[PDB]
Structure 1
Amino acid sequence: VGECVRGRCPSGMCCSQFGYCGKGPKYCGR
């Protein structure tokens, strides 16, 4: 996604280390 809701996303999608989001290791990793 564009950027999280200040480090929260819906349906437990992970805010990446980059402050973007999506429900997987692409974001959630590291």
Structure 2
Amino acid sequence: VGECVRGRCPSGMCCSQWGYCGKGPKYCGR
């Protein structure tokens, strides 16, 4: 359901290797 738009994040967040959006090293890798 909540996975990255249907492929990306909002213009400022990072899509994790879980396919889910956020910030920090679980999401941006840094």
Give the structure-1-normalised TM-score: 0.55
In structure 1, stretches of 5+ residues that fail to align are none
SS in 1 for 2:26: helix
Larger Rg: 2
* Higher share of residues assigned helix: 1
**Aligned residue pair count:** 30
Q: Percent identity?
A: 97
In structure 2, stretches of 5+ residues that fail to align are none
What's the CA shift for 1:24? Answer: 1.4
Inter-partner Cα distance in structure 2 for 1:7 and 1:28: 15
Give the structure-2-normalised TM-score: 0.55
What's the CA shift for 1:2? Answer: 2.1
